[PDB]
């Protein structure tokens, strides 16, 4: 049962965020949750074009970099490119078929679109600082180490899309498909979407911010100012994207939306905690590849592991989970100048 | 078998537009078909927000209109709202899991996104001209003369989405699902894509143009000018979208992108021909509903039907079909003032 235009005249204020009737009329005169409408308007105010930022001094700054700082810069760029390539298409393929209220259907499409813009700014940077872009791009797919700190991100989205396809086609029940017993359960798909949403929150609120801090390290040295203007604009969109998932998650938790989602939130709490612990440790392991050829004066593995700890405690707090790391002050308060 | 980051390193310049390996890295330095990167760029420089078009005067223009004209105006606006409600979501949920080159993936998302902006301008007009938005918006879902068409459009996308899930889940073959035999054939899924794309080409290239003619008739009499400035901007976007589907269709039937789409476009030639005559006749009929209580100045059912015949011949001709109607000069040359 998915349809692009459902023929039941319904009250779109009484639907859940997810799993109710597919949206048919897109109206903005009213909304169940104003925050998603606020976010769409704010994102639309931030419209920027990468191509209009000057990155010409960066080819000079980059070639003047020692090989090992050149490696730190490019591995960090590569991982940013991977993440927003996944973020450009995935909100639209994984969540959009499950949404039931229009402000959130348009928010998810606006958010996915702002990530296609970020992907365009990584082509803008790479093609100006490096001579054959294809050696950077091809290496993103094949690099054992980039796939390693990213382990689990596409997996999860792909598990959700498969389960949604099963539910849309067969409906709830225990079924026989090519002599295999397949059970489709809506409670389970709801657990799957809830955990998908906690992981999207960890990827935008932690993993992108650790990368941002590696980018602005150079801007503190007065290097790579074009790259830095772009990343500041990417950070500004990223704050909206994170506010979005934090509000979806906390509204699901309150029990004001779908009552089954509030029970799942409480029932899934340990899995939520563990995935943020998982994402933190993946970010800390990456440092071993990033500082492989030696580190930089303001950026080494001890600094990085300390900001990963710092930022995870903040992020887990904002969505009401127990803090895993011992409380500490911001290791790199210069990031404050450049951010969000 | 759908994935959000295919781990196979692959040369994206050699992938077909559809049904090859999912796109993993989103890059814009090179492209197999330059035309989709040229459309992303025109669509980003065409960016506008409906909030800064003042529509306030249109409230009086509309109250002053004779009831039959209020009816032609609001019925036309309702149909436009129905079509971009389907067009914000549907490019994304239906085409995006089938695309295998990056520049076409980002065009589909940019395209979907410019449609949510169109949806938002319609709430912007409605809010300022009738002030109980709900009597317009709920009547979109139930209205018999409108519902007529929605059903046809949603059908194409809904069967392609249902078939695509079967292919992604089970692959080609004869499968059994709870006692039934289900045959999944990629040849048949390619047919569904072709005719779905053909129907969207009619949607943006004909159905939307017939509706622009009714909006601009008010603008010719210096009525509904807020609305007319907005439809101008929407019409400018429509021109890009139509260029999108015309290029994809002609690249498919030329055999250049997939030899087998050339075969299918030839077997599906008479079905495509009827598809278009049916869209045209559905538009001709709609005019009878509009002009039931009497016509207005500059437009009447004869004029409008003539305009439908003319726009349908220009569009069929552009996708290599034979013309069904008597060759004609444009019946309302004044509309070129408002169009591209």
Curated annotation (Swiss-Prot), chains A, B:
Regulation: Inhibited by hydroxyurea, leads to dNTP depletion, replication fork arrest and genomic instability.
Signals that turn on the gene: Induced 4.2-fold by hydroxyurea (at protein level).
Keywords: Deoxyribonucleotide synthesis, Iron, Metal-binding, Oxidoreductase
Cofactor note (record): Binds 2 iron ions per subunit.
Active site: 122
Cofactor: Fe cation
GO cellular component: cytoplasm; cytosol; ribonucleoside-diphosphate reductase complex
Listed SUPFAM superfamilies: Ferritin-like (SSF47240)
Catalytic activity: a 2'-deoxyribonucleoside 5'-diphosphate + [thioredoxin]-disulfide + H2O = a ribonucleoside 5'-diphosphate + [thioredoxin]-dithiol
Binding annotation for Fe cation 1: 84, 115, 118
Record keyword GTP-binding present: no
Domain of life assignment: Bacteria
InterPro entries (alphabetical): Ferritin-like_SF (IPR009078), RNR-like (IPR012348), RNR_small (IPR033909), RNR_small_AS (IPR030475), RNR_small_fam (IPR000358)
Record PROSITE patterns: RIBORED_SMALL
EC number: 1.17.4.1
Keyword Oxidoreductase: yes
Miscellaneous information on this protein: E.coli produces two separate class I enzymes. This one is the functional enzyme during growth.
Matches recorded under PANTHER family: RIBONUCLEOSIDE-DIPHOSPHATE REDUCTASE SMALL CHAIN (PTHR23409), RIBONUCLEOSIDE-DIPHOSPHATE REDUCTASE SUBUNIT M2 (PTHR23409:SF18)
Subunit record text: Tetramer of two alpha (R1) and two beta (R2) subunits. The B1 protein is a dimer of alpha subunits. A radical transfer pathway occurs between Tyr-122 of R2 and R1.
Listed name of the protein: Ribonucleoside-diphosphate reductase 1 subunit beta
Organism expressing this protein natively: Escherichia coli (strain K12)
């Amino acid at each position: 049962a998915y349809t692009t235009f459902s023929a039941t005249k319904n009250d779109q204020l009484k639907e859940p965020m997810f799993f109710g009737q597919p949206v048919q009329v897109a109206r903005y005169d009213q909304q169940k949750y104003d925050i998603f409408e606020k976010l769409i308007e704010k994102q639309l105010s931030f419209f920027w074009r990468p191509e209009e930022v000057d990155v010409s001094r960066d080819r000079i700054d980059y070639q003047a970099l020692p090989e090992h700082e050149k490696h730190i810069f490019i591995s960090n760029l590569k991982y940013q490119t991977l993440l927003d390539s996944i973020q450009g298409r995935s909100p639209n393929v994984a969540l959009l078929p499950l949404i039931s209220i229009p402000e959130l259907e348009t928010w998810v499409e606006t958010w996915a679109f702002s990530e296609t813009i970020h992907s365009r700014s990584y082509t803008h940077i790479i093609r100006n600082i490096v001579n054959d872009p294809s050696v950077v791009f091809d290496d993103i797919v094949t690099n054992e180490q980039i796939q390693k700190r990213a382990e689990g991100i596409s997996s999860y989205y792909d598990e959700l899309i498969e389960m949604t396809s099963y539910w849309h086609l067969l409906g709830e029940g225990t079924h026989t498909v090519n002599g295999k017993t397949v059970t489709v359960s809506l409670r389970e798909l709801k657990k799957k979407l809830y955990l998908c949403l906690m992981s999207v929150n960890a990827l935008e609120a932690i993993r992108f911010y650790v990368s941002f801090a590696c980018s602005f390290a150079f801007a503190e040295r007065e290097l790579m100012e074009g790259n830095a203007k772009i990343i500041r604009l990417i950070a500004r969109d990223e704050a909206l994207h994170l506010t979005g998932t934090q509000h979806m998650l906390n509204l699901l938790r309150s029990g004001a939306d779908d009552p089954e989602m509030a029970e799942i939130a409480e029932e899934c709490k340990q899995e939520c905690y563990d995935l943020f612990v998982q994402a933190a440790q993946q970010e800390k392991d990456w440092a071993d590849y990033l500082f492989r050829d030696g580190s930089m004066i303001g950026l080494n593995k001890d600094i990085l592991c300390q900001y990963v700890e710092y930022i995870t405690n903040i992020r887990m707090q904002a969505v009401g989970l127990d803090l895993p790391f011992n409380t500490r002050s911001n290791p790199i308060p210069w990031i404050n100048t450049w951010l969000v």
